[PDB]
Design an enzyme around this catalytic site. Structure first.
Site, short mmCIF file in Angstrom:
data_model
loop_
_atom_site.label_atom_id
_atom_site.label_comp_id
_atom_site.label_asym_id
_atom_site.label_seq_id
_atom_site.Cartn_x
_atom_site.Cartn_y
_atom_site.Cartn_z
N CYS A 133 60.11 -3.79 29.95
CA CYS A 133 60.77 -3.07 31.02
C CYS A 133 59.84 -3.01 32.25
O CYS A 133 58.72 -3.49 32.11
CB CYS A 133 61.12 -1.65 30.58
SG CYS A 133 62.42 -0.92 31.58
N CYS A 135 59.77 0.11 34.14
CA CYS A 135 59.57 1.50 34.58
C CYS A 135 58.11 1.93 34.53
O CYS A 135 57.72 2.81 35.29
CB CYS A 135 60.43 2.48 33.76
SG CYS A 135 60.32 2.22 31.97
N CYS A 143 63.73 1.63 35.79
CA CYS A 143 63.57 0.54 34.84
C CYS A 143 63.78 -0.85 35.43
O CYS A 143 63.44 -1.86 34.79
CB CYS A 143 64.53 0.78 33.66
SG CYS A 143 63.94 2.16 32.62
N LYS A 210 70.91 2.35 23.94
CA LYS A 210 69.90 3.35 24.31
C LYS A 210 70.61 4.38 25.20
O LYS A 210 71.16 3.98 26.22
CB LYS A 210 68.72 2.69 24.99
CG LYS A 210 67.63 3.62 25.49
CD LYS A 210 66.57 2.88 26.31
CE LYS A 210 66.23 3.72 27.53
NZ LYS A 210 64.86 3.46 28.06
N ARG A 220 57.42 10.26 28.60
CA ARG A 220 57.21 10.06 30.02
C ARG A 220 55.77 10.35 30.44
O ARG A 220 55.26 9.73 31.38
CB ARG A 220 58.18 10.96 30.81
CG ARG A 220 59.64 10.61 30.59
CD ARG A 220 60.38 10.54 31.92
NE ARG A 220 61.82 10.73 31.77
CZ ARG A 220 62.61 9.97 31.04
NH1 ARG A 220 62.11 8.94 30.37
NH2 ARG A 220 63.91 10.23 30.98
N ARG A 232 68.43 8.26 35.36
CA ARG A 232 68.74 6.98 34.73
C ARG A 232 70.08 7.01 34.02
O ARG A 232 70.25 6.37 32.98
CB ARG A 232 67.64 6.60 33.73
CG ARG A 232 66.26 7.16 34.04
CD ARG A 232 65.28 6.05 34.39
NE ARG A 232 63.89 6.35 34.07
CZ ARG A 232 63.28 6.08 32.93
NH1 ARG A 232 63.93 5.50 31.93
NH2 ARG A 232 62.00 6.40 32.75
N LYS A 263 68.73 4.14 20.10
CA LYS A 263 67.75 5.12 20.57
C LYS A 263 68.46 6.17 21.40
O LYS A 263 69.24 5.80 22.29
CB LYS A 263 66.65 4.41 21.37
CG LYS A 263 65.74 5.32 22.20
CD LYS A 263 64.80 4.46 23.05
CE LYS A 263 63.56 5.23 23.49
NZ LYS A 263 62.71 4.35 24.33
N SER A 290 60.35 10.56 21.25
CA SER A 290 59.33 11.58 21.44
C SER A 290 59.89 12.98 21.35
O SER A 290 59.31 13.86 20.69
CB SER A 290 58.61 11.33 22.77
OG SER A 290 59.56 11.32 23.82
N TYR A 329 56.71 7.64 15.32
CA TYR A 329 55.39 8.23 15.50
C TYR A 329 54.89 8.88 14.22
O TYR A 329 53.72 9.28 14.13
CB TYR A 329 55.40 9.25 16.65
CG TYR A 329 55.90 8.63 17.93
CD1 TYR A 329 57.14 9.01 18.44
CD2 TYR A 329 55.16 7.66 18.61
CE1 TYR A 329 57.62 8.45 19.61
CE2 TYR A 329 55.64 7.10 19.79
CZ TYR A 329 56.87 7.51 20.27
OH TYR A 329 57.39 6.97 21.44
#
Ligand SMILES: *C(C[NH3+])CCC(=O)O
Ligand SMILES: *C(C[NH3+])CCC(=O)O
Ligand SMILES: *C(C[NH3+])CCC(=O)O
Ligand SMILES: *C(C[NH3+])CCC(=O)O
Ligand SMILES: [Zn+2]
Ligand SMILES: [Zn+2]
Ligand SMILES: [Zn+2]
Lengths: 341, 341, 146, 341
Positions: A133, A135, A143, A210, A220, A232, A263, A290, A329
């Site tokens: 991407c 972004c 993006c 997404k 972010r 976005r 996502k 996240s 994660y």
């Protein structure tokens, strides 16, 4: 006085009896259409242009921005516990990097390509995925490449993205994961890999579904990818857009995706099930984002749930819904836990 | 030096272009297959045998155990903001109530039936749903009547449940929601309502897909329904049991359910989608359970997400996945928010 | 007396054996007889014995006749007397019969199904994956294949 | 003491009774959706550039490398017993034949085209199929033309294959069977036959689902096709790749295949069933490969099974799974056996 009433009942119908299939611990394993294994895990890495970086991303519990000099010591234990795959994100902080067209996205001196070269050298059996991407590399934080009114420019954006993706593959990435959600970018990326003679060894893992929403928070910061100029919502899918998500899945598969990502994950499990039908012949990946991961951690330290328990419940959730891959994660935690389980 | 590479691109294919359908605020509404309205909401009430009760359930933010003398003042504003439906749970605390067969479950002097009579008298336009189970009324804390080895006794359990459900309907409940997950209980409840001449006015809302897991926390306190003797994994569905859930949906519809509930909700959205196919001609309900709701609150006060934003995202999630009804502890909040939206 | 199978006594006997294993402590019963309707009676027997809630019925729903059983018969001293087992084992080409047997045993209470043999019958496993999509499907790698 | 317990049983349900359909020998024939006939058989021939060759391929029981002067006497009895089809493979042993681009694959003086001319002359009613690939003709032993890093070159490979296939058809082959598994080769072969005005009389029989694995052994000797430089896993399908196989079936049908081959056969019967749906309007062929056939022979001479019995069981297996054609080294045996049966 008041006594227990029992109604007169009929003999048991066989059709009613489900319990014979889940009365034992081993059975609740026999009942899963897919079990979680270590090679299903994909761990994100956020690579700094400061090669000595190992900085906490306060919004993303237990995860850091790492530089190439600190990567070997980080990844070594992980690989030893069975980690098979990483997804790279670059976070270039050196000033004057960011420009309107994301020039540094495929800077050979940049964190991603350096990361790719390091990992290929030091962990040659590691499967490398790169987020594709603009972004993290643009000035406006969007993006793609924008027209003057600040809307996205589809053509230059996708022309730029195709370039970045092929350049990662030229550098040694095994897989490209375009996360831009800009119309038709998979076609152009595929066409670019074909023209570069890399389509036969590069997996295109499209973020085909997404969604926009409140779960991206902690990232972010981790990527310093905070937008500039509005939101976005004109390319991220709207949370209720099941129809648009189904069409996006069909489209990216037609345009050459070898696999797809949904996502966020837990809040979009129905879309994973949708995907399991539309893209039944393709690997489906869940991205535990996240905000979802941070939500689990918060609720846990608040006592609402147990971390490992809700981790297994949610990640089993992904497999139940049809995913066979998981970007998460909690990968360090699961490489440990899966030995016992 | 390093400049932005742009690959040579083809004309845009029409097949690639999705963006024309979601570039404006009104469009992301046109894109939803169902919109959230006030009459979709169902609010749980936990009714105390102490008629002066209005006690905080510390594990369940903003929700209390209420007695009948305090209900009128509680429900009055709610109804005025548009609340159309409640789901009753009784929490009898007077000692010596609980017995091995759940005798007090349908005690005419008990919190549920008193609640039913109060609400019918004071809010006659309110649609009353009663949870049907024995776990709040038993000594062992289990959802049914048990054999001596502590396993569930299907026959007496379901014979007892049928009785309780019909007795609620006899008292004035419009709908019974059996949450026991014991094999064949819907058949017997339906048969009991038919024998009592109430099947034509009683909606059977089956918890047909109620899963075991880590999200029930805050409730057990709210209902003092903490088990005694092991776990509820032998009848609650195991988190990975998609096949068992599909069969349970088919079964309860065959046995007379007029509607079905999937519980929990966010972590099981794929099961809601499954249900939207199997039970396409029936109302599907999502239950936003205490652990999910408490997780949202924790993450919110930790700054991970915004409460109202993640509330709309998750509850829109239910409708996207095929639910058209929602049992939720955020019902007070939504009766407010839906005026604006 | 003519040496054909007696469905009724056979299945009445099998139901008994299966329940008795469960009474002894078996977690799962796997009826391998292929006699019509035996799963219904076994299920009904476990229900009557209050064991249906903890006993998994794993039916050999698609067990085929053929040349791959060799080594087992020795292992079990199960060599027949009086002809062959082709009147109840499915015939190798009987895909239709196998599909109907899968549907039947699931309707009669199987919690799971076995396809036997395995490698030489993989297409039947795929058939089963559709018909019995909500049930665990088991492959038996039989003595002749192994 | 211990006596036989018999449980109390219900009347027989009609739904339970399957036995009326297979209690007699003729019925187990009525129960097959397709019966094996002689014209379903396709016999492989391995043609030597030594025209006096008739050499045992020790790894492939009862099969030899034959030269054109010995073919007439070999094929004559076969045709008389009903053989309708052959699949040609050339095995050129004369040194200096093999080169990086498979030049001799379509050498008019080569074993295949000579074979085609012989058979057209001496057995004009014989249907001739030619395997199309480069692995028997290359120096490295790989199925296509390779880049310098040793990976396959899709474009030159497929450009070369198209040429070879059309050249076989120009020589008199009725059918081309490309076994290379290189992406898009069927499109180019079809396009080449169309440009050569042969598409209307040349059947394209694609190895659309040819898998990698341990069953190719005996062949490599029979064809001296042992690789050089690694393995064929980057284009042969991986044994677990059902999704890839389904997509390959769809692709080759879209690109012009008139028929498809699944290889190997017994170990991939589920893929044949998959194919029977995807390619329901096309002939489906099973290839009984050298390792499978050799496995049957070994187990037989070890006493585990009877050769003719397991031969009929496996080949009936192919028809059950949806094949209507069979490439097999037991074709001589079946032309005999089918007279009796
Ligand atoms: C998505 C980047 N493509 C990741 C966002 C997150 O918070 O995980
Ligand atoms: C389910 C009672 N049937 C409710 C559990 C919760 O926490 O909401
Ligand atoms: C089947 C017994 N039900 C087993 C046969 C074998 O050889 O494995
Ligand atoms: C396949 C050649 N395309 C044949 C391999 C074998 O052993 O039969
Ligand atoms: Zn981006
Ligand atoms: Zn209960
Ligand atoms: Zn080849």
């Amino acid at each position: 006085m008041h006594t227990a009433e029992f109604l007169e009942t009929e003999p048991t119908e066989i059709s009613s009896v489900l319990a014979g299939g889940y009365n034992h611990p081993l059975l609740r394993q026999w009942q899963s259409e897919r079990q979680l294994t270590k090679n299903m895990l994909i761990f994100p890495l956020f690579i700094s242009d400061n090669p000595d970086d190992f900085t906490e991303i306060d919004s993303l519990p237990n995860i850091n921005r790492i530089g190439v000099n600190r990567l070997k010591d980080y990844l070594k234990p992980l690989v030893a516990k069975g980690l098979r795959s990483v997804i790279l994100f670059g976070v270039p902080l050196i000033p004057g990097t960011k420009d309107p067209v994301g020039t540094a996205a495929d800077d050979p001196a940049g964190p991603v390509i350096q990361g790719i070269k390091f990992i290929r050298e030091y962990f040659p059996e590691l499967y490398i995925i790169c987020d594709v991407c603009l972004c993290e590399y643009t000035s406006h934080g969007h993006c793609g490449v924008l027209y003057d009114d600040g809307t996205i420019n589809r053509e230059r954006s996708v022309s730029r993205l195709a370039a970045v993706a092929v350049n990662y593959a030229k550098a040694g990435a095994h897989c490209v994961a375009p996360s831009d959600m800009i119309d038709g970018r998979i076609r152009d990326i595929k066409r670019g890999l074909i023209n570069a003679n890399l389509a036969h060894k590069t997996f295109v893992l499209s973020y085909a579904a997404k969604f926009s929403g409140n779960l991206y928070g902690p990232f972010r910061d981790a990527a310093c990818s905070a937008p500039s100029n509005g939101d976005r919502k004109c390319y991220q899918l709207p949370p209720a857009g099941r129809g648009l998500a189904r069409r996006a899945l069909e489209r990216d598969m037609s345009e050459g995706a070898d696999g797809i990502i949904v996502k966020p994950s837990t809040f979009y499990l129905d879309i994973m099930r949708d995907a399991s039908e539309i893209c039944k012949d393709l690997p489906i990946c869940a991205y535990h984002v996240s905000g979802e991961y941070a939500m689990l951690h918060a609720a846990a330290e608040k006592g609402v749930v147990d971390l490992k328990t809700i981790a297994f419940e949610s990640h089993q959730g992904f497999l139940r819904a049809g995913a066979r891959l998981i970007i998460t994660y909690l990968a360090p935690e699961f490489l440990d836990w899966l030995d016992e389980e």
